[PDB]
Design a protein around this motif. Sequence first.
Motif, PDB file in Angstrom:
ATOM      1  N   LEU A  97       0.806  -1.223   0.000  1.00 20.65           N
ATOM      2  CA  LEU A  97       0.000   0.000   0.000  1.00 20.65           C
ATOM      3  C   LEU A  97       0.839   1.274   0.000  1.00 20.65           C
ATOM      4  N   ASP A  98       2.160   1.143   0.057  1.00 19.58           N
ATOM      5  CA  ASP A  98       3.064   2.282   0.049  1.00 19.58           C
ATOM      6  C   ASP A  98       2.838   3.152  -1.186  1.00 19.58           C
ATOM      7  N   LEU A  99       3.164   4.443  -1.061  1.00 16.46           N
ATOM      8  CA  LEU A  99       3.092   5.346  -2.209  1.00 16.46           C
ATOM      9  C   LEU A  99       3.980   4.867  -3.349  1.00 16.46           C
ATOM     10  N   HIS A 100       5.061   4.165  -3.029  1.00 14.06           N
ATOM     11  CA  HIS A 100       6.032   3.717  -4.023  1.00 14.06           C
ATOM     12  C   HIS A 100       5.811   2.258  -4.401  1.00 14.06           C
ATOM     13  N   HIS A 101       6.123   1.944  -5.661  1.00 13.04           N
ATOM     14  CA  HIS A 101       6.077   0.572  -6.153  1.00 13.04           C
ATOM     15  C   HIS A 101       6.944  -0.359  -5.315  1.00 13.04           C
TER      16      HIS A 101
ATOM     17  N   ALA B 299       3.022   4.843   4.908  1.00 14.89           N
ATOM     18  CA  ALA B 299       2.066   5.904   5.189  1.00 14.89           C
ATOM     19  C   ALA B 299       2.270   7.126   4.309  1.00 14.89           C
ATOM     20  N   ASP B 300       3.032   7.004   3.221  1.00 14.36           N
ATOM     21  CA  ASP B 300       3.341   8.171   2.409  1.00 14.36           C
ATOM     22  C   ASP B 300       2.268   8.493   1.372  1.00 14.36           C
ATOM     23  N   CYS B 301       1.136   7.769   1.379  1.00  8.90           N
ATOM     24  CA  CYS B 301      -0.041   8.168   0.611  1.00  8.90           C
ATOM     25  C   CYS B 301      -0.894   9.188   1.342  1.00  8.90           C
TER      26      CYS B 301
ATOM     27  N   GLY C  65       6.774   0.967   6.517  1.00  9.91           N
ATOM     28  CA  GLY C  65       7.382   1.347   5.254  1.00  9.91           C
ATOM     29  C   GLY C  65       7.626   2.846   5.246  1.00  9.91           C
ATOM     30  N   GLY C  66       7.342   3.462   4.105  1.00 15.92           N
ATOM     31  CA  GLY C  66       7.476   4.899   3.994  1.00 15.92           C
ATOM     32  C   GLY C  66       6.538   5.629   4.938  1.00 15.92           C
ATOM     33  N   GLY C  67       6.715   6.941   4.972  1.00 14.81           N
ATOM     34  CA  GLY C  67       5.931   7.794   5.848  1.00 14.81           C
ATOM     35  C   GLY C  67       6.825   8.842   6.454  1.00 14.81           C
ATOM     36  N   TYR C  68       6.800  10.046   5.891  1.00 17.33           N
ATOM     37  CA  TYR C  68       7.810  11.049   6.190  1.00 17.33           C
ATOM     38  C   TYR C  68       7.265  12.216   6.991  1.00 17.33           C
ATOM     39  N   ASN C  69       5.980  12.202   7.305  1.00 14.94           N
ATOM     40  CA  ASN C  69       5.377  13.071   8.310  1.00 14.94           C
ATOM     41  C   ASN C  69       5.240  12.180   9.538  1.00 14.94           C
TER      42      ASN C  69
HETATM   43 ZN   LIG Z   1       7.192   5.074  -0.128  1.00 10.39          ZN
END
Ligand SMILES: [Zn+2]
Length: 399
Positions: free
Chosen positions: A175-179, A268-270, A310-314
Amino acid sequence: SVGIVYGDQYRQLCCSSPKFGDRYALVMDLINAYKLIPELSRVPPLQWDSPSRMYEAVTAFHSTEYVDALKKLQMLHCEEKELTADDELLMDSFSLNYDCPGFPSVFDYSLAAVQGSLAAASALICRHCEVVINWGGGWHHAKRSEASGFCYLNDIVLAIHRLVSSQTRVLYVDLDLHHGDGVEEAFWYSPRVVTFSVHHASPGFFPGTGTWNLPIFLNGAGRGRFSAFNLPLEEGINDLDWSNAIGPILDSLNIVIQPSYVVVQCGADCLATDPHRIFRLTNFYPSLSGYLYAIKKILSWKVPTLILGGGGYNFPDTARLWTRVTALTIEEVKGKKMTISPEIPEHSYFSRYGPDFELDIDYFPDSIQKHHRRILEQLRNYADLNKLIYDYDQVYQLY
Ligand SMILES: [Zn+2]
Ligand SMILES: COc1ccc(C(=O)NO)cc1NC(=O)c1cccc2c1oc1ccccc12
Ligand SMILES: [K+]
Ligand SMILES: [K+]
């Protein structure tokens, strides 16, 4: 029960990187501030009997020379002297540079995520937990011999390898913003691990894959043909449209694959408030958060499930989302209502949630039908190639 990976040294290592800072501490402390920890089974990170056993575990996916280089990078960054020209070239040969730099704890940091996700898989395998959460894992870009996108060791691939080797089929949902390229690649030739990434893709956007490649859509090879699924989405998509985009795909994959395990990467970067500012998803739990919609749907299947970060930059907003995911998982698995105050409770990191200190993030909220047709045909092709039994029209009607 629902398990969750944490521990004192685990927390320290997960908070030791330059990119992600103390994010893991915020996440776990917000879960703790909401009184969720007594509802969860602590899953301790895996530790090994020897260096040799640790290398055996990590090199189930990664090459020896890459692991050697990653360990050397840590050692070099614990000295004061600059790298030699030869050592710079060595690190460059493994992409241990640029967005995957060295730092004094780079090996211990990356290995910790592997330790957590391997322990989480084991807790599922022995049926101690029905679901396990690891918010220190989810590093989906790392490749056999290459660091990518601040992912140094692919904890997901190693956890999935443990699950399949425990016929066993795993469904991986990214579900990450990135592939989710590293996981997809690792299982490109394997029909037993079906991967499905939904992500943004556009020219020049990292990592570039998960979309049309005249362009064709690659989907696995060898006996893994048709076993890698992708849904690339244009920027700006909101909770409802993202939910309607992935909902039928998820339900169709579960019906056809009948997975033994599900592994979900929940980067969480979506979120609309992520600094990428690409998608417009929320953590709202009445518009319903696309993340919470997806997790609730997956958990309704009653399949043992690994939930990763995974991602998530906030960082505060990632903690806001993952606290809501954690509470939802408790509710859906145990049937026990988790009432969560709309106001952030007082705790050591309370000041990070200003100015308003609420749990909701601060946000005021054709192409997909073509993808749905393409994906449904690929699923039919996957089921045919793998001699799987399923009602084509019950699946077709989902869309
Ligand atoms: Zn990401
Ligand atoms: C190649 O980049 C990535 C590859 C993979 C991923 C990923 O999440 N994979 O699943 C993410 C990025 N880039 C960023 O994280 C980034 C993006 C925008 C702003 C920031 C970013 O980092 C920051 C750190 C400190 C301050 C600001 C930022
Ligand atoms: K993804
Ligand atoms: K596959």
